[PDB]
Amino acid sequence: DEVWDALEEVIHGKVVLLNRAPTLHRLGIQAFQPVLVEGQSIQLHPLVCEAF
Amino acid sequence: YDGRTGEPIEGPIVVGQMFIMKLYHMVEDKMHARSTGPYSLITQQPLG
Amino acid sequence: KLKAPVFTVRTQGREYGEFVLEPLERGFGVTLGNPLRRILLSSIPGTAVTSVYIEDVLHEFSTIPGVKEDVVEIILNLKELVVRFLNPSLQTVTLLLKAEGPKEVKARDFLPVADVEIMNPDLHIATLEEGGRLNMEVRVDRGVGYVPAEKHGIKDRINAIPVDAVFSPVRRVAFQVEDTRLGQRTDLDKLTLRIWTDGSVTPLEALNQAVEILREHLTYFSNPQ
Amino acid sequence: LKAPVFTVRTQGREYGEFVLEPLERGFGVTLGNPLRRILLSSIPGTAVTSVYIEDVLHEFSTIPGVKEDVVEIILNLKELVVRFLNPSLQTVTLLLKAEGPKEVKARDFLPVADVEIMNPDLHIATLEEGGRLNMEVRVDRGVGYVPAEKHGIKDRINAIPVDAVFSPVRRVAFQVEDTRLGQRTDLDKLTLRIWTDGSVTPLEALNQAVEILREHLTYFSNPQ
Amino acid sequence: VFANPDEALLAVAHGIVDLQDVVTVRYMGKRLETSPGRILFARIVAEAVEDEK
Amino acid sequence: AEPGIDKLFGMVDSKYRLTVVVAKRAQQLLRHGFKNTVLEPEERPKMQTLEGLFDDPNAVTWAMKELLTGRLVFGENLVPEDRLQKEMERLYPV
Amino acid sequence: QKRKLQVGDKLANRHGNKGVVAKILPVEDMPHLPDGTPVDVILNPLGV
Numbered sequence: 001d002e003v004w005d006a007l008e009e010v011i012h013g014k015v016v017l018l019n020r021a022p023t024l025h026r027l028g029i030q031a032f033q034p035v036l037v038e039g040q041s042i043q044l045h046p047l048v049c050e051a052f
Numbered sequence: 053y054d055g056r057t058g059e060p061i062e063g064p065i066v067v068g069q070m071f072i073m074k075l076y077h078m079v080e081d082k083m084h085a086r087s088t089g090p091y092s093l094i095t096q097q098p099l100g
Numbered sequence: 101k102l103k104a105p106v107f108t109v110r111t112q113g114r115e116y117g118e119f120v121l122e123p124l125e126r127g128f129g130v131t132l133g134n135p136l137r138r139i140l141l142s143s144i145p146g147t148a149v150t151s152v153y154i155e156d157v158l159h160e161f162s163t164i165p166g167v168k169e170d171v172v173e174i175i176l177n178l179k180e181l182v183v184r185f186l187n188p189s190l191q192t193v194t195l196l197l198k199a200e201g202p203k204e205v206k207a208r209d210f211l212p213v214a215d216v217e218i219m220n221p222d223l224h225i226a227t228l229e230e231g232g233r234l235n236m237e238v239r240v241d242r243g244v245g246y247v248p249a250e251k252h253g254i255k256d257r258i259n260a261i262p263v264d265a266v267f268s269p270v271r272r273v274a275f276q277v278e279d280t281r282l283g284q285r286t287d288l289d290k291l292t293l294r295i296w297t298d299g300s301v302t303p304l305e306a307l308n309q310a311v312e313i314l315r316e317h318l319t320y321f322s323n324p325q
Numbered sequence: 326l327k328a329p330v331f332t333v334r335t336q337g338r339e340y341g342e343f344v345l346e347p348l349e350r351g352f353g354v355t356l357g358n359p360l361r362r363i364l365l366s367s368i369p370g371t372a373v374t375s376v377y378i379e380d381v382l383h384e385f386s387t388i389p390g391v392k393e394d395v396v397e398i399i400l401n402l403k404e405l406v407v408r409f410l411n412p413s414l415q416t417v418t419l420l421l422k423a424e425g426p427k428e429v430k431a432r433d434f435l436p437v438a439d440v441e442i443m444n445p446d447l448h449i450a451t452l453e454e455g456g457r458l459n460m461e462v463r464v465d466r467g468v469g470y471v472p473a474e475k476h477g478i479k480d481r482i483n484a485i486p487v488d489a490v491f492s493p494v495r496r497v498a499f500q501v502e503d504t505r506l507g508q509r510t511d512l513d514k515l516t517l518r519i520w521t522d523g524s525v526t527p528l529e530a531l532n533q534a535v536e537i538l539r540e541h542l543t544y545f546s547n548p549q
Numbered sequence: 550v551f552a553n554p555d556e557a558l559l560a561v562a563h564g565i566v567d568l569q570d571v572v573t574v575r576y577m578g579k580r581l582e583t584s585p586g587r588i589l590f591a592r593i594v595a596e597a598v599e600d601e602k
Numbered sequence: 603a604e605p606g607i608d609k610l611f612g613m614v615d616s617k618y619r620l621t622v623v624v625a626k627r628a629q630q631l632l633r634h635g636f637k638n639t640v641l642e643p644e645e646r647p648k649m650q651t652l653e654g655l656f657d658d659p660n661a662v663t664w665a666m667k668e669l670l671t672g673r674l675v676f677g678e679n680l681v682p683e684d685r686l687q688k689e690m691e692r693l694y695p696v
Numbered sequence: 697q698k699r700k701l702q703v704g705d706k707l708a709n710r711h712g713n714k715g716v717v718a719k720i721l722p723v724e725d726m727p728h729l730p731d732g733t734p735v736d737v738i739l740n741p742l743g744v
């Protein structure tokens with residue numbers, strides 16, 4: 001369980017790039033600060049769905 | 053009624069029994085990640 | 101079982117405060133936040149103006165000659181008045197105000213009544229000019245919640261205008277539930293309670309009174325039949 | 326307002342009605358909902374957590390002479406209601422030994438001290454002539470819903486973890502009427518309806534729910 | 550006729566009026582003939598930007 | 603949004619110059635172990651850890667907050683590259 | 697493996713309405729009938 005605590009310190013301040021195909025415009029790739037969540041699905045903000 | 057507050061929903065809600073299917077596309081079989089792994093023979097690029 | 105949560109308070113001034121309770125079991129932020137908000141907005145004892153009498157005024161939709169504010173605006177300012185009774189046995193007082201133009205009438209212009217404190221003496225009531233006379237008698241009661249003027253319909257004398265009684269000192273309640281973790285438990289709840297109060301009572305006191313009211317009602321489930 | 330009168334109407338050990346009147350306007354929801362949330366979530370009870378069947382290695386197998394497979398048998402065992410008559414009892418193992426042809430029920434478990442089966446007529450498996458069913462069902466005490474993947478309790482090598490639904494409360498509804506006292510007619514009449522599996526009476530579940538809320542209200546005492 | 554948005558929303562919380570009912574609310578020093586919901590929307594924007602004017 | 607991002611964009615004529623300044627400053631901070639920072643001890647970025655409140659290891663976060671203070675000088679042909687690297691090592695040993 | 701319904705699994709009905717499970721709520725959080733029966737699935741009316 002201490003590994004998961006160390007993973008939080010790894011991703012602190014860092015961002016990841018989220019991309020949905022097809023990338024018709026540049027906002028098809030956007031940077032988000034990842035929040036670690038239980039499960040296997042990526043949680044996406046409702047307000048960026050239109051751009052993607 | 054709203055289970056969180058106990059107050060009713062301000063308008064009547066269409067509530068009924070409907071037949072819903074669970075499809076073969078599951079996030080368990082679709083989630084994938086890789087840091088480093090196998091590479092191509094010629095292009096030396098990561099496999100897919 | 102989950103460890104007892106930490107109750108942290110962030111109170112600024114005497115009219116606003118934030119209270120955080122974490123960690124909580126899943127769903128207990130909603131379980132606790134909603135009852136307290138309902139009690140805070142409807143059950144905290146307070147004082148309010150319930151009737152006003154102004155000389156030479158017949159109806160609420162009229163206006164006094166010699167003052168910028170009409171009857172409605174003065175009534176609206178009266179609803180902003182915050183008064184705190186210093187005597188627990190005291191139930192109702194009447195505040196007298198005699199003003200001559202061209203002064204700006206304030207809440208401090210009310211005649212001092214024993215065991216009666218005006219929390220906001222800088223509140224603006226009316227603005228007078230030369231030849232303007234404002235003779236006003238306001239009736240202050242004790243109660244809870246919000247009561248429309250037409251509901252209680254309190255009149256001390258003829259031509260008295262009933263006014264909406266904002267008894268509750270709590271101006272606004274907003275509670276937020278956030279997901280928190282304690283080790284490998286990830287479904288825990290973080291409850292943040294934000295209370296706005298008129299200043300007669302501290303938001304900490306309002307929360308304490310609301311918790312006591314909820315606690316007292318839980319003792320009602322004691323003696324069957 | 327004066328102290329409300331509390332009225333209790335019970336239909337056996339599984340259903341009960343609790344009336345609290347008169348209450349101020351808005352206290353029907355203010356009191357009913359928190360209890361309903363606590364009743365539906367945080368009431369301790371008993372549930373089957375692990376089952377071991379002789380000559381069975383996993384739950385994805387069938388037993389000769391038994392009509393139902395292990396998955397269906399485990400589904401039947403999830404409906405078993407076990408009442409611990411001893412408050413200090415935390416774990417019990419129920420032993421079932423049956424030989425075909427018979428319809429083995431929940432009443433066929435070997436008797437255990439301070440343990441009562443609230444639904445003896447529950448169907449577990451159908452035994453055909455020449456079929457045998459030797460099971461060791463472990464019943465634990467807990468709160469909430471614990472999937473088998475979390476607790477992973479195996480009393481022995483071939484024991485099969487079972488998803489545990491410890492909550493005895495089956496359904497909660499609370500009802501608010503237009504009651505009147507004196508000259509004021511906005512008062513609330515709160516009626517709590519509790520359905521429980523029978524291991525815990527609805528009166529006991531209500532008492533525990535009140536205590537849980539009362540304890541949580543003591544958390545607002547010491548500011549930091 | 551409400552003296553402030555807090556009083557108007559307190560009445561909504563107490564069930565006297567709905568968010569869509571047109572009432573009189575004094576806001577920004579102006580006597581507005583609007584609904585509490587429209588007044589509520591104004592407070593949403595004001596608190597989000599931390600600037601009421 | 604990044605804190606003070608509007609102020610960061612207003613200090614540069616091209617938005618990509620801001621990124622270059624932040625990224626170059628971040629590697630300067632990483633190279634010297636955050637000992638060359640212009641932030642006061644009460645101004646250092648922090649992260650919440652179970653053990654306690656510790657310094658933020660993300661140098662990009664440090665670089666952005668340093669630029670907001672105004673103690674950093676950026677531009678083209680300010681100092682020779684060889685002279686810059688050598689002098690920083692002397693006054694900030696690592 | 698015995699797969700239970702989880703967040704990200706795709707559900708659908710016979711009328712072309714499809715979607716992934718995005719949230720799993722406790723029983724006390726779901727909207728319920730006045731008799732105390734909670735609903736099982738909440739569907740967005742905007743998809744109709």
Ligand SMILES: [Mg+2]
Nearest residue numbers: 372405406490
């Ligand atoms: Mg059960």
